[PDB]
Design a protein around this ligand. Structure first.
Ligand SMILES: [Cl-]
Ligand SMILES: [Cl-]
Ligand SMILES: [Cl-]
Ligand SMILES: [Cl-]
Lengths: 314, 313
């Protein structure tokens, strides 16, 4: 018993030359459809995907009726009609997740048997069928009902060759003046609110179409003896665009020699991070089949080091 | 013994005591204006983030002011006596964004600069003594902060208002059985949903502190009467949070001979708008703490699980 990540039910005749306009390999999906109608057939379709690809099948006159999907709008239901003879595609009807309707039909011959299509998830990867002068046959490729959409195998392939730009900023300054002849001891304390940020760029509307999560560690900064290095922290699950608020702290004892002053300044390092990334988008269906698409882009991040301090005697 | 605030008052012995402090509601210093004479600080006017405003001593045309930006705190502060040590003589501070404010006496020698421990740099107000002039003053600071957590979350009107669950359709399919025996099919559906939670805050606590909320979310729950609100499992949240997920439905469809069953997948969506009360707790690095009661509105968006109506023709 085999299961599949996509579903395709083609309708019409046996004529024409095979065509396939599929955004499967990069998770590109149907953005816009334009349909031209003849007397006894669908004459042509123009189809746009979310990655910019645009293709025409059959032929397009100016009876052309269009529909552009909104971001996050999917297909609730779809019906295809043959032309009655069983030799052409006769009509296309769909209704979206937002109740918007699109209907393109034969002008001359009336419609006959209506095939109601299982749309799976309603997320369409494009179309497949046969065409020449007309659309002999066509179906819509759908991803079956989705269980999860996770970006994983996260890599920062240039991180190992780049140094962090860490800018220091002062947080607090305090002075202790010992004008006695007994050593003194105080406790210094300081805190700072910080907001860390992580963004993975996405394309082809995958952020609005799929509920994305990212299983990965994020770029952090490590202070070593020589300077600063990039590492990647513990793996966890993230939104594609995320921020984390936190309070950093620092405390230590300060010993103040007899007849001396010590001045303490607390600082933190802040790094804007801009790095290319590679990962894979795995879409896993309810049925257990899956779809992988390689991803490439830019990680933008904001991070901080731990707080430090300089104590100087005067 | 340890305290959640630190206060060091500089100046003379004279005048009447004042304390102008946002501790009880975690309101902080928004703005300060200071008037100076020849041998003293003449007056201060202070505004907190909850709209309170008060003046001590006397204000005149000499006055110079400083208004804090959101998220700006104090990095360093010095105060000087007047060098007779009868009055406050000067105030100086530098912020977390390196803006400076200095106001002093016009004559006279400033003598010993007292460099002040500003704790966390988050100022709750001022305290000192004043008559005609500012005899003495200090700034009240929260000591260094370890955490800032909103807890004991309650929704008091929750049991008294009924959810408004609007239903949406997700998927329709038709199963026609033109055969002489019963047929069985699998129907599957999925939908991306965005859940949202939002606890209102005031007095800039959201930009001064890094807030987290330890609490359950209002959710919708099913009974025979229909739908009521309930509070979910407890976890840690940001004040303003969204959670993306994919809801799914799978069930078998049985179609009698020469019958059609039409299956519509739906989901229920509820906007929530409820009053809340809670406690802001600020815990210091030193182990002390500061509690402030909170009130506001919780806004939310939640979803029921997916369901399906199967209708026999
Ligand atoms: Cl299909
Ligand atoms: Cl100290
Ligand atoms: Cl007095
Ligand atoms: Cl914030």
């Amino acid at each position: 018993h085999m299961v599949y990540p996509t579903t395709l039910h083609i309708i019409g005749g046996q004529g024409g030359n095979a065509f396939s306009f599929n955004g499967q390999e990069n998770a590109a999906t149907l953005q816009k459809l334009s349909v031209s109608v003849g007397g006894w057939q669908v004459r042509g379709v123009q189809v746009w995907l979310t990655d910019g690809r645009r293709e025409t099948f059959g032929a397009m006159d100016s009876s052309a009726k269009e529909f552009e999907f909104e971001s996050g709008e999917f297909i609730k239901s779809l019906s295809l009609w043959g032309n009655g003879a069983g030799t052409r595609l006769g009509a296309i009807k769909f209704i979206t997740s937002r109740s918007r309707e699109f209907f393109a039909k034969m002008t001359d011959w009336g419609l006959k048997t209506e095939y109601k299509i299982d749309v799976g998830s309603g997320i369409c990867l494009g179309v497949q069928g046969r065409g020449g002068s007309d659309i002999d046959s066509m179906g819509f490729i759908f991803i079956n009902a989705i269980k999860s959409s996770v970006i994983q195998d996260m890599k920062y392939p240039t991180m190992h060759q780049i140094l962090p730009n860490v800018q220091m900023e002062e947080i607090k300054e305090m002075e202790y003046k010992n004008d006695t002849s007994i050593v003194q001891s105080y406790t210094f304390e300081s805190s700072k609110k910080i907001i860390k940020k992580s963004s993975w760029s996405t394309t082809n509307k995958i952020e609005s179409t799929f509920s994305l999560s990212v299983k990965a560690g994020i770029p952090e900064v490590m202070e070593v003896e020589t300077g600063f290095s990039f590492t990647v922290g513990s793996e966890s699950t993230h939104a594609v665009e995320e921020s984390e608020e936190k309070t950093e702290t620092l405390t230590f004892p300060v010993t103040v020699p007899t007849h001396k002053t010590v001045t303490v300044v607390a600082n933190i390092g802040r790094a804007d991070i801009d790095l290319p990334y590679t990962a894979l988008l795995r879409i896993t269906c309810v049925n257990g089949a899956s779809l992988d698409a390689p991803l490439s882009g830019i990680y933008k991040g904001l991070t901080y080091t731990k707080m430090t301090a300089v104590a100087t005697e005067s």
